[PDB]
Every structure is written in structure tokens, then in C-alpha cells.
Amino acid sequence: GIVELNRQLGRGVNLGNALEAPWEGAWGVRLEEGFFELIREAGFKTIRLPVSWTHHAGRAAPYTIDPAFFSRVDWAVTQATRRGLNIVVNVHHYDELNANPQAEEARYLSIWRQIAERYRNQPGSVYFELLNEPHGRFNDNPQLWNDLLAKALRVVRESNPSRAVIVGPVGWNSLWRLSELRLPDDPNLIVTFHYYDPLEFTHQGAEWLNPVPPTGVVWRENQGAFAAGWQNWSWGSRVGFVGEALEITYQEGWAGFYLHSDAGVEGYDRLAFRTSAPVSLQVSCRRDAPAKAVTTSGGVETVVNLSECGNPSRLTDLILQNNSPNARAAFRLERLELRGPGSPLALLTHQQNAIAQAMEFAQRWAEQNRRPIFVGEFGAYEKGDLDSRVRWTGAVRSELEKRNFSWAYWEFAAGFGIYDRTTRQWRTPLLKALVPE
Ligand SMILES: OC[C@H]1O[C@@H](O)[C@H](O)[C@@H](O)[C@@H]1O
């Protein structure tokens, strides 16, 4: 059973900044035989092996992969199997494929044919991952990635008829894109996504972004936040999480509190909200649609049916607009949630329940499509304070294992690593946030 394989994945870690670089050690990490034993001792069961093959394969057909690089990957797989561990071999970075899928398709398929035919006789502890974090042109048209992964799975199944293949959506394997993912009817598929929300914390001070985001961002389970997948598009207003509620200062006429979700939600019929003071508002759940005028009163809930403010089939935009030509004094939005025949959705929450909501969306998609879930990457950069990193990592791990998700932390050493190669010591708070045995 594919579910049994995905459960045998369990807990794992990434050997990052290694083989996914232009060459091994180019990004700081060279693979050593002792890392596998350390990972086996720490309590993990799986090792995800980021490998970028585009640097070690011919540019012209038949696009042969360099045999020495193949020997390196064979050494990695053998060290993983010798220590009772699973190993996920993937196609990681591939800028030529993401920038031009049509032209690079033949080379990608030949690379995957070589990889599959080489490891066709490996036991069930060896997993395949077609493409890590598809982006670029795959974001422009996820059907390109759907067709390409269909072709790649065809190629793989030509020699591996029942090996677990790990497939993910576009948008850098964002779960908020699972809705656009289309898989064939193959029984042995494992859906994957990478969780790095919020990006303001997990990637703070990441020198490879442009803009490199500010540093010193704190993360706590009580730190106020919006619902997962909802961005703040408010215009002309000071919107800020002060305490457990949300302070809103309408700074000009017809300014509005705006929450946008690229993914969207379905199955909700009315929106409920409560403010600290009486405010006049225009409520809009559909942009370019008739908003509804509602007058508030302090400490008093207000529920407006979505049918009377836009009536959207898929709720993507939500606007509480200052129904006034002038500015207004600051107030506190203390509640904001959507309700329907099923469970509600708290749009105001903390980072903890935001992680919870993200995992709930992922689990709903997984159950409706009947696919096991393996979170391939999650972690916080070292530029954040260690306490916040430990709290975030523990929260994500707990909410992943609540949803029966197999996961692979990012990463083992260096940047997001849990092992300090300099001191030869485990970063114990992070390790216990991962494995509290
Ligand atoms: O140098 C560190 C490297 O980290 C990786 O995770 C990024 O994808 C690269 O863009 C970067 O160069």
C-alpha cells in the first residue's frame, strides 16, 4: 500500500546545500559517511537527498549523466539503506526546465529515464520525487507541470512499476496550489508540499532574495496573525496586531481593511465580526460587486450573509471599507470568521492556529483526493532568534504529525541545520522541537 510507504517515511531530514548545488560542497556542505549514522541515531527514518542533475548531464541528446556523479548518488543511497533508512532521490533545482519547459522537456525526461533505470531494483526504502518546487513558467500555467509530470511518471513507470513517486504542486510546492494540481490515476503517488509560512519569519535575513527581508522577527504561538493564505491588502489604514485583537485606524476617506487569498475558500455562507466601538462599514466579499452597508456597535457581534455582499462561489477577497468620506478613530476588530454548514474559519488568530488552518486545508485536499501527504521541506533560517525558531519548528512538527503527515525537516547542517559541524554537536533545542522522544 502507498499509504504504508508514506507512513514508513515518517520523520526525515534533508542533506541540503550539498548535491543540489552546482557541485557537491559548492554551497557549504560535503556529504560524509558519519552524517547518515548521526541521523539514524538522532531518531530519524528518512533522508531526502536534493540532487540537481542539470549540471552533471550532457546538453545534447541523449543527455547522459556523468558516471562519477551517479557513483556519488549510489554511495548516498547505499549509506542510507545500510543504516536502515529510507532515501528520497529527487530532481531538485533545474532553472532551465522552470524557465523553458517545452525545450528542456526532452532532457528532463531522459534524465529521469536514466535515474529510474539505474535504481529500478532498489527496495521499497528508495523513493522518487519528480521535480522539487516547480516555479517560473509552471506558475504561469500549472497545466504545463501537470502534463510534464504525467510524461515523467510514464517514463519512471516504464522501469519502476510500483515505486512510490512523490509529486507536488506549483508555486514552489505551495499547498495553496494543490487545487490546481492534476495527477493521473496512479495508485502509488505521494503528494508533497513545503511549508515556510510565515515567510517574514522563516526567511528573515536571507541574503539570496532581493529584497533581503528585515531581521529580528519574533514568532510565538500567541503572536497575532491572519488566517493562513490571507494577505493584508489594506489601503490607507494603519492595520496592526496589538494584543489578541487587531487595531484598525482608518486614515482617510473610503479606506478599507482588505484580506486577499490567492487560493480561496468554499463552503461558507455568512461572515461574522465584532468591533470594540460602533463603526459604519461597507462589507464586500466580491470585488467589483455591490457591497452592503452595516452599522456596528461596541462589543456586539455582527453577521452578514455572503449572498448580500457579492455572493462569491469562491471567496478570495474580503473588504471592510470605511463607509465615510473622512478618516475615523482607531478601533479593535476582536472577531472575524466565516461560517457555513461545517466548521468555521477564524480569519483572526495566532501563528499557531494559522499553522493549524494551513494543515487543515492540506488535509481536506488530501482526503478529497485520497492521496498520502509528505511535507518535503520546512524550517526557519538561522537569522531568527533560536527560541522563536524552536517554537515554530515544534509547532509545525506537531501540527504535521496531528494530520498524519510524513515530513522531512530542512535542513541537516548549515543554514537551517540542526547539526553544528563546527562543534560536532546537535543543536539540541531544535532537535527536540523535531524529536522530543
Ligand atoms: O547560497 C545559499 C543557497 O541556498 C539555497 O537554498 C538557495 O536556493 C540558493 O539560491 C542559495 O545560493
Residue numbers in the entry: 17 to 453
Provide the authors' own sentences about this structure as they appear in the paper:
Subsequently, sugar-bound crystals of wild-type MtGlu5 were obtained by substrate co-crystallization with carboxy­methyl cellulose (CMC). However, it turned out to contain only one protein molecule in the asymmetric unit, with a high solvent content of ∼70%. In the refined model of MtGlu5, the conserved CD has a (β/α)8 TIM-barrel fold and the inserted CBM shows a β-jelly-roll fold. Presumably, some CMC in the crystallization solution had been hydrolyzed by the active wild-type enzyme. In the catalytic pocket, the glucose molecule is sandwiched between the indole side chains of Trp43 and Trp224, which are presumably engaged in stacking interactions. The binding site is adjacent to the two conserved catalytic residues Glu149 and Glu393. It corresponds to the −2 or −3 sugar of a bound cellulose substrate, according to the general nomenclature. The other sugar units were not observed because they were considered to be leaving products and were not properly retained in the active site. Notably, the inserted CBM is not a fixed attachment, as its orientation varies with respect to the CD in the monoclinic and tetragonal crystals of iMtGlu5 and MtGlu5.
